[PDB]
Amino acid sequence: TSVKPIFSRDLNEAKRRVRELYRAWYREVPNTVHLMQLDITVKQGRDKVREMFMKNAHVTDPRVVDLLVIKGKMELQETIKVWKQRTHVMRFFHETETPRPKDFLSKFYMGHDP
């Protein structure tokens, strides 16, 4: 509604600015896993990454998208360097905690969880 824009215009110009970032994360799964050892080989690391970009596709606002690029660059700027550790990079995965039942029937055998 005649808002102040930041770093881009209507979405379809911000969608390449996205791809500058996938253009880095797609080439920085193999560099991390070797430099700081890990369990994932390369691939399920790349599945997880696209599994985060296929969470925020629902967005429709340029200002929001122009923001979410940034926090990705920070974590990239934290990941490209060794400022993280083997526990931070391998934190997204939710490896350990059991995924709850997405269905109804098993969801309330434990937990008053509507």
């Binding site: 005649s2 102040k4 606002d61 340029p62």
Partner: peptide
């Protein structure tokens, strides 16, 4: 400069 949008 400015941009138009009406979203949620």
């Amino acid at each position: 400069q400015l941009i138009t949008v009406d979203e949620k």
